[PDB]
């Protein structure tokens, strides 16, 4: 039409928001922000629909305008903020930290972390290039721009950032054999170790990953995300250690949980 | 207004295209500038998409011309338009337009060329053993005004910038000027 669309209808909402169908006509319409806004969750979905600390739009407004809800080292009072992958959401009054990760079935969990693994975050880089006066800088998929990059940190790689020094402390070089976890598509959620990476001139680079227990799959580059060097992750995985389990297997889990009680 | 739409054209097969929209702004045009060469220098603001500004140069006399073979770029004053690769009428009515051929003062270039105690003549003798200075441009200095190719977009940026002719381009335009 004749400008930006400022309403979002619940059915048009991303499928991983889980939100119901007769709940209304409209959805939170996540504001423009630092993350892709189709791969994100508004802090209203973080508060009302997952943690249930409120029960209405206006009560979530009270939550956020109290200045309690602090994201990534700094309080964000916007109620449609596109919080997404490894954004850390802290609450001083509850002294309670959360970190937003994919779970194996393609959705977002809020995994609790203690303070030491909440002092910092971890994100991949979009691309590193020069700027004014020849000073190099790199761009992350969180949008952050970092100047004077370590001369070895390259594109597609991963970098840890503290919230006080607010710069790089270490980086994982995206390469063969380091644990990744896909962040988009049908394979999203599953962690695994890269086992192969083939490139075709002029198209998306394909990443073949193997899970911790035998299964193998493939993914496009924009979706994969190294976590740690080697098999060991540098982040606390959720209750499913990044293994997507077949529906038969997950039926057996619930059957066994039934027959164990 | 003036429109850049592909709607009013035919199709590639040659059939008419029934209209389905009313004209949109983001397919507009604006009427050309026909930048004259005149003393009463006049460049007017136009406010375009994105809110930024373009400089419609209605008429200029003073331009900015480079000399690549010696890498010196001097302000100068335009003399006249003498050749224009699309239309003779544009030469006739003296419109400043990209890839046109104007004539320039040679005053900044002469006074530069005289440039380039013992510290001075030592540097002059270090140079001036490499002067080549083709006769085709030297005779043009002796005539007192140089051919130059305007390379800016005066209706787009509001300037008459350009470069002095040398070499095959000089000699080809020359061989058309007689």
């Amino acid at each position: 039409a004749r400008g930006l669309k400022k309403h979002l209808k619940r059915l048009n909402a991303p499928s991983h928001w889980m939100l119901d169908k007769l709940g209304g006509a409209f959805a939170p319409k996540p504001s423009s922000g630092p993350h892709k806004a189709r791969e994100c969750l508004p802090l209203i979905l973080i508060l009302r629909n997952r943690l249930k600390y409120a029960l209405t739009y206006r009560e979530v407004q009270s939550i956020l305008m109290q200045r309690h809800i602090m994201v990534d080292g700094k309080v964000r009072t916007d109620k449609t903020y596109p919080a997404g992958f490894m954004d850390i959401i802290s609450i001083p009054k509850t002294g309670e930290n959360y970190r937003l990760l994919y779970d194996t079935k393609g959705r977002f969990r809020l995994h609790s972390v203690r303070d030491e693994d909440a002092k910092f975050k971890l994100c991949k880089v979009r691309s590193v290039q020069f700027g004014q006066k020849g000073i190099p800088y790199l761009n992350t998929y969180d949008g952050r721009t970092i100047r004077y990059p370590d001369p070895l940190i390259k594109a597609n790689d991963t970098i840890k950032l503290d919230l006080e020094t607010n710069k790089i402390v270490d980086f994982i070089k995206f390469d063969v054999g380091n644990v990744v976890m896909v962040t988009g598509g049908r394979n999203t959620g599953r962690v695994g170790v890269i086992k192969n990476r083939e490139k075709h001139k002029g198209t998306f680079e394909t990443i073949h990953v193997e899970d911790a227990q035998g299964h193998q799959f493939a993914t496009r580059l924009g979706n994969v995300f190294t976590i740690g060097k080697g098999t060991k992750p540098w982040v606390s995985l959720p209750k499913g250690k990044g293994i997507k389990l077949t529906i038969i297997e997950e039926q057996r889990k619930r059957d066994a949980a039934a027959q164990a009680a | 207004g003036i429109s850049r739409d592909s709607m009013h054209k035919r199709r590639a097969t040659g059939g008419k295209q029934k209209a389905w929209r009313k004209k949109r702004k983001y397919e507009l045009g604006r009427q050309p500038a026909n930048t004259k060469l005149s003393s009463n220098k006049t460049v007017r603001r136009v406010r375009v998409r994105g809110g930024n500004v373009k400089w419609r140069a209605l008429r200029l006399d003073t331009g900015n011309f480079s000399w690549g073979s010696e890498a010196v770029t001097r302000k100068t004053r335009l003399l006249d338009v003498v050749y224009n690769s699309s239309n003779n009428e544009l030469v006739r009515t003296q419109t400043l337009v990209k890839n046109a051929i104007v004539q320039v003062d040679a005053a900044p270039f002469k006074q530069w060329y005289l440039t380039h105690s013992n510290n001075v003549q030592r540097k002059l003798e270090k140079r001036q053993q490499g002067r080549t200075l083709d006769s085709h441009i030297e005779e043009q200095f002796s005539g007192g005004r140089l051919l130059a190719c305007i390379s800016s977009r005066p209706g787009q940026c509001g300037r008459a910038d350009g470069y002095i002719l040398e070499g095959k381009e000089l000699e080809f335009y020359m061989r058309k000027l007689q």
Binding site: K201, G202 | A12, S69, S85, N99, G167, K168, E169, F172
Partner: protein
Amino acid sequence: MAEQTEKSFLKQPKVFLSTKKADKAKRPGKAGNRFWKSVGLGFKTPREAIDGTYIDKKCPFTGTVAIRGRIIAGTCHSAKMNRTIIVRRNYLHFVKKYQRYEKRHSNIPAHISPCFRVKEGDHVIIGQCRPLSKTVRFNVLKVVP
């Protein structure tokens, strides 16, 4: 000289001919040497596009067009225009009601550089570029006769 044939002097942008300090081996496109660009994708820049005198701003190798998008193969259907051909993309179509194939086709205008030399009905490989004209969105990258 032959290639300068129009009412303007044809010349390659940002390439400066009559320079003082010139040398035959610095990099092409610099110090008076003709510009060319390896379009890539395994396509090899032709020898006469290297040592060619023609000046052509729509050539993939020597011009200002970048080959990006999708790549097609077709056949030269006619070479009756200036620096352009129409490639016919024969293929087959699936009629789902009938489980059979009907052959459809499409004529595609494609810009050739003067480096290439096409006769009617020559296998060609073309790649997508910026819109050069009303109908031309492709440049010829390979010609197999």
